[PDB]
Structures are given as structure tokens and as C-alpha cells.
Amino acid sequence: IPEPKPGDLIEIFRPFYRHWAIYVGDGYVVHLAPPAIVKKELLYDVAGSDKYQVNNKHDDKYSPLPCSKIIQRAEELVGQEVLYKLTSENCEHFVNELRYGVA
């Protein structure tokens, strides 16, 4: 897999779970983690042995926001709590809000 662009959605294929993250560069992604807390961590470390892919699933319906706006919002949330639990669907929702906005 070539290096993703900043703002790209990353789908991580666990056994029995789909963890999502958004690429913010230099090997880093922003994603949710159990204490949910927003973390900025290296994709190699997050994925471990699991496969992953870029999956900008909704680029056919919505334009991504400007890359600098995606990154600013992702960075503003790093270290902050979110009010829902980790599920595959909640994780995907989280990164979709970053790439596409609240709509």
C-alpha cells in the first residue's frame, strides 16, 4: 500500500471487527482508543499484523473538506474524550465526520 494522503480514511481489518482511522501524515493516524479517547498514533503500531486499506467510501456522494481543515479538526480532538463506545460503526462514523464534516 502506498502512503495515503492526509485526510484519507483507513479501514483496519481485525478478526471480527473493523477499526477505522484517518491519515494525518508522517505515518500517523487519528483514531479512537479505549481509556473512548481520541489518539494520534503511528499506523504501523495501530494496525499491528492486521491488513488495512484506504477506503474513502463516500467520495462519490460528498466532497472531502479541505485537507488543512480535516487536519485542524482531527488535531483539535487529539487527547479529548468522545461520548460513545468503540464499535466498528461508531469508529467509521467518527472518521467520516472528520473527512466530510457533520453532513
Numbering used by the authors: 5 to 39, 58 to 125
Publication passage describing the model:
The small GTPase RAS proteins operate as “molecular switches” that fluctuate between inactive and active states. These switches can be activated by the exchange of guanosine triphosphate (GTP) for guanosine diphosphate (GDP), which is promoted by guanine nucleotide exchange factors (GEFs). The H-REV107 gene is a known member of the class II tumor suppressor gene family that has been identified as a growth inhibitory RAS target capable of suppressing anchorage independent growth in vitro an in vivo. Here, we found direct interaction and inhibition between KRAS G12V and novel H-REV107 peptide.
Several studies have shown that H-REV107 is ubiquitously expressed in most normal tissues, however, expression is lost in human tumor cell lines and tumor samples. In contrast, induction of H-REV107 expression resulted in growth inhibition of RAS-transformed cells in vitro and in vivo. Characterizing the molecular details describing how H-REV107 binds KRAS G12V is essential to understanding the molecular mechanism through which H-REV107 inhibits oncogenic KRAS mutants. It is known that the H-REV107 protein family can inhibit the RAS signaling pathway, but the molecular mechanism responsible for this is unknown. We obtained the fraction crystal of the N-terminal domain (residues 1–125), but the electron density for residues 1–4 and 40–56 was poor. The crystal belonged to the orthorhombic P212121, with unit cell parameters a = 42.935 Å, b = 52.997 Å, c = 62.796 Å, and α = β = γ = 90 o. The structure of H-REV107 comprises four α-helices (α1–α4) and six β-strands (β1–β6). The H-REV107 peptide was synthesized in a water-soluble form and its fraction was designed from α1 to β5 (amino acids 65–74).
